Amino acid sequence: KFPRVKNWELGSITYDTLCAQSQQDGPCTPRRCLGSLVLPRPAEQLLSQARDFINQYYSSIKRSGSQAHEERLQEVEAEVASTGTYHLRESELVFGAKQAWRNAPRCVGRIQWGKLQVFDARDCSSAQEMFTYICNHIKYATNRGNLRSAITVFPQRAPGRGDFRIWNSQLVRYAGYRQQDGSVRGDPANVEITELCIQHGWTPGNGRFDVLPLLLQAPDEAPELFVLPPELVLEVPLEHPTLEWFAALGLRWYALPAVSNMLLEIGGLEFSAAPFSGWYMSTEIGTRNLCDPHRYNILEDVAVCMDLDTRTTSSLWKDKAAVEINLAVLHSFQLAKVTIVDHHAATVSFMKHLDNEQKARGGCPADWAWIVPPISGSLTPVFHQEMVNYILSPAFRYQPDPW
Amino acid sequence: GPKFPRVKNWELGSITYDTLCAQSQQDGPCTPRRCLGSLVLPRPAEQLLSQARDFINQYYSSIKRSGSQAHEERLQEVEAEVASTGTYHLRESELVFGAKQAWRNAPRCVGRIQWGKLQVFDARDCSSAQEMFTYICNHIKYATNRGNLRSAITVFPQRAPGRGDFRIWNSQLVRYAGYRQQDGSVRGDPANVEITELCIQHGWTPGNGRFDVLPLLLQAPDEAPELFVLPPELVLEVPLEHPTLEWFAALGLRWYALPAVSNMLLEIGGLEFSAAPFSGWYMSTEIGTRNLCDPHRYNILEDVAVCMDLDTRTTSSLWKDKAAVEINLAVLHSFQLAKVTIVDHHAATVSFMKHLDNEQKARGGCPADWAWIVPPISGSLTPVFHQEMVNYILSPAFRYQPDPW
Ligand code: HEM
Numbered sequence: 001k002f003p004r005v006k007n008w009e010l011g012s013i014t015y016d017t018l019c020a021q022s023q024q025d026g027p028c029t030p031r032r033c034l035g036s037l038v039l040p041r042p043a044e045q046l047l048s049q050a051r052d053f054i055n056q057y058y059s060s061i062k063r064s065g066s067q068a069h070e071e072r073l074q075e076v077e078a079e080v081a082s083t084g085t086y087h088l089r090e091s092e093l094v095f096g097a098k099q100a101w102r103n104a105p106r107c108v109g110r111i112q113w114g115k116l117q118v119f120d121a122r123d124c125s126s127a128q129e130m131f132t133y134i135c136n137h138i139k140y141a142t143n144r145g146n147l148r149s150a151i152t153v154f155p156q157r158a159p160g161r162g163d164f165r166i167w168n169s170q171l172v173r174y175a176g177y178r179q180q181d182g183s184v185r186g187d188p189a190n191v192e193i194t195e196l197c198i199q200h201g202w203t204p205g206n207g208r209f210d211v212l213p214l215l216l217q218a219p220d221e222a223p224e225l226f227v228l229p230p231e232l233v234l235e236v237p238l239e240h241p242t243l244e245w246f247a248a249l250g251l252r253w254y255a256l257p258a259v260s261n262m263l264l265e266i267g268g269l270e271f272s273a274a275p276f277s278g279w280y281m282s283t284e285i286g287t288r289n290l291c292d293p294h295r296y297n298i299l300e301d302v303a304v305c306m307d308l309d310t311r312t313t314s315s316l317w318k319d320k321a322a323v324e325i326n327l328a329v330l331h332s333f334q335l336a337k338v339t340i341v342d343h344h345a346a347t348v349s350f351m352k353h354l355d356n357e358q359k360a361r362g363g364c365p366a367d368w369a370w371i372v373p374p375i376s377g378s379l380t381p382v383f384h385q386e387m388v389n390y391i392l393s394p395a396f397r398y399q400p401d402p403w
Numbered sequence: 404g405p406k407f408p409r410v411k412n413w414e415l416g417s418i419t420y421d422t423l424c425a426q427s428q429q430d431g432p433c434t435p436r437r438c439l440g441s442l443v444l445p446r447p448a449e450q451l452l453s454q455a456r457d458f459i460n461q462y463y464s465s466i467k468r469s470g471s472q473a474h475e476e477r478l479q480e481v482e483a484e485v486a487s488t489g490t491y492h493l494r495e496s497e498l499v500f501g502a503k504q505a506w507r508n509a510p511r512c513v514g515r516i517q518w519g520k521l522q523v524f525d526a527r528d529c530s531s532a533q534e535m536f537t538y539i540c541n542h543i544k545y546a547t548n549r550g551n552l553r554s555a556i557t558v559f560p561q562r563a564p565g566r567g568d569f570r571i572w573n574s575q576l577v578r579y580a581g582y583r584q585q586d587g588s589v590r591g592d593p594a595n596v597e598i599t600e601l602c603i604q605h606g607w608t609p610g611n612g613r614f615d616v617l618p619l620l621l622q623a624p625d626e627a628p629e630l631f632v633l634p635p636e637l638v639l640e641v642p643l644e645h646p647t648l649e650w651f652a653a654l655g656l657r658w659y660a661l662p663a664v665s666n667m668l669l670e671i672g673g674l675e676f677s678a679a680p681f682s683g684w685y686m687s688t689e690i691g692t693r694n695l696c697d698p699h700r701y702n703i704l705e706d707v708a709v710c711m712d713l714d715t716r717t718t719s720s721l722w723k724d725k726a727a728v729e730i731n732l733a734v735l736h737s738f739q740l741a742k743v744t745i746v747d748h749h750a751a752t753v754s755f756m757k758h759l760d761n762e763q764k765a766r767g768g769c770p771a772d773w774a775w776i777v778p779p780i781s782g783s784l785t786p787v788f789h790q791e792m793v794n795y796i797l798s799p800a801f802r803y804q805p806d807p808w
Pocket residue numbers: 097101104106107108109110112116149150151276277278279280281284341346370396
């Protein structure tokens with residue numbers, strides 16, 4: 001039965017009929033909901049996913065049932081029957097990559113889904129070539145602070161061979177150096193990748209904000225190490241518009257959020273290396289990256305500098321510090337002329353996206369726990385909006401770490 | 404590993420498995436195809452007997468007399484009673500156990516560390532709306548306790564074959580009126596427009612203020628509801644001021660001390676208590692973020708931001724975030740000054756994490772609804788944000804029920 005979906009602020013109701021198109025199971029059952037969990041616990045199969053995708057494509061260009069549509073289905077059928085696999089045309093790959101972003105239930109930035117630069121790198125045969133494609137992606141996407149969304153797609157998985165992989169979780173990441181006494185210098189999220197880098201011959205630094213090299217892997221070969229040229233990595237020093245001591249904290253963040261460990265699935269084909277980038281929403285940096293207790297954990301430092309009463313939770317010292325940190329991020333990115341969006345503007349655009357998709361497709365898969373921002377939740381319109389979460393394909397998925 | 408849900412805390416890196424969800428007898432709204440975890444209200448002789456047996460088994464397990472002669476004789480007594488009357492009745496100690504268990508089982512409640520401390524008033528002898536009012540007044544006096552709040556539930560007679568239900572029409576024992584204006588706006592609390600109009604229809608002379616306490620509309624079996632005015636000295640309220648912003652007191656804001664929810668159904672062993680009002684103390688974000696700042700509630704964010712001289716013409720000034728923090732601080736400061744129990748969202752969530760550890764040891768899990776447990780401001784600043792949770796329905800339970808009108 002199709003869900004009735006209510007907005008509690010406005011009193012409006014919609015019905016999600018799009019979820020009927022879901023062909024893949026999520027983690028929930030009638031006995032228990034696992035919606036808050038971060039990670040998940042043959043030729044006829046491939047052919048039906050392929051046909052479905054080809055049908056989506058020809059529908060998208062208003063050519064369902066055309067000459068071209070019918071011959072393409074026959075091509076895919078012939079290739080799968082003979083070889084167990086098939087290959088996408090570039091225009092199909094472009095459509096597929098935009099659709100995977102459109103379908104991503106955890107992404108609040110999907111108003112932008114139609115504006116995605118797609119780099120075809122399926123003719124890549126070595127880690128060295130991967131690095132060249134990656135440098136061009138970063139160059140294009142960064143665009144001197146006028147950020148532009150992009151994806152680069154490396155060769156698909158093949159039954160015979162190992163995968164193409166980027167070992168790093170993002171193209172730009174700060175090192176996390178574990179101490180002989182358990183603690184971490186830098187970003188604790190990156191301890192393991194930092195150790196792998198050193199293990200593969202990288203000379204580490206000893207700073208809080210050391211940009212990591214890339215570990216890039218061509219099929220069935222040890223990963224190779226490539227240092228990013230410093231001029232390609234745009235960073236923003238953090239300052240606060242009114243609190244002078246904030247700059248003294250020596251905080252900074254990189255401009256480009258470029259996720260590089262997710263699998264892109266299109267028509268049953270799997271692209272194990274397909275890094276994509278957009279621009280940041282300020283709470284990712286200001287709230288999670290800087291204030292998570294298991295990340296840079298700066299809340300106490302800032303609260304102390306603001307002379308707040310740290311001895312009791314009821315002074316709301318954590319809340320006051322977090323606001324000023326998020327304000328510093330916004331101010332600093334605006335001063336540096338680097339694209340950033342605040343959580344109010346982003347969630348308002350996402351509500352417009354929900355409306356657009358209701359009209360276009362009869363629904364929009366959305367994961368409430370990820371869409372609602374990590375500060376000021378109920379001050380944004382998405383908090384009051386019921387959402388239905390489900391998996392459509394094309395999709396971005398998690399995959400195992402290659403080590 | 405084990406074939407039970409694996410649950411991770413991302414701050415600590417620690418893992419548990421929920422085995423308690425195996426005891427769920429009732430389906431939620433989700434399927435493998437789609438998750439409906441974010442929806443607020445998603446959509447019998449033999450049946451009663453099996454619910455009753457299960458509940459009697461839980462009771463005897465809890466007093467460690469499972470399989471005993473007293474356990475079997477109680478099962479036989481319930482079977483006999485049902486056989487001859489179609490229903491049964493709980494012993495006083497079963498009702499106390501069942502009420503505490505319903506609170507313990509409530510997945511949307513962040514206050515469950517307190518579950519073992521619940522004063523259960525047995526009002527199952529009540530036979531009139533006038534008497535319900537007396538019991539409600541007594542509950543309020545006990546629970547308010549001059550500002551040193553005590554958790555309590557008052558249980559009125561269960562639903563019974565044929566006979567009509569006991570109902571409290573109001574969603575809470577204390578609610579502010581919401582008066583629809585000629586222009587289309589609302590004076591007072593917009594959440595309460597419908598109950599306000601019903602009170603007027605049933606004969607209440609309305610005021611015209613922003614914080615008018617509503618009368619109670621109380622319904623005894625097969626009777627029209629009757630109107631009762633709470634004596635003002637029984638309704639403890641807290642005027643709001645801010646510790647540093649001296650002008651905040653001039654806004655004339657206030658909130659009542661006692662959150663006393665009155666429209667939920669208490670279900671124990673298949674028996675249905677349609678009138679069982681219960682009360683705790685407030686967590687400060689309920690007042691300061693939701694009731695005062697929701698766009699569809701008092702909606703005071705912009706007024707406060709304007710007084711703070713913030714830039715309300717652009718999202719990126721974070722004016723909403725700054726105003727909300729100060730409003731929440733005012734609530735905490737004001738309740739503290741008034742010596743009225745309140746808990747901030749950091750303290751509440753820290754205690755809930757302790758509750759989760761206790762329940763993992765006691766029962767092998769704890770049903771929890773992440774979207775409701777994570778506070779509405781400062782979510783990731785609290786430890787619950789980083790904790791995966793498994794949501795499922797156990798009974799005894801507090802359940803939603805349709806409006807009596
Ligand atoms: C244009 C600017 C964009 C903004 C502001 C944005 C915003 C966000 C945010 C805030 C999240 C949650 C991130 C987190 O908490 O770690 C997210 C998740 C995601 N976004 Fe975007 N997004 C953007 C562009 C993109 C692009 C270009 C793609 C792919 C083409 C994409 C795909 C995703 C996916 C797959 C996730 C979920 C990742 C996961 O489950 O771990 N987004 N988005």
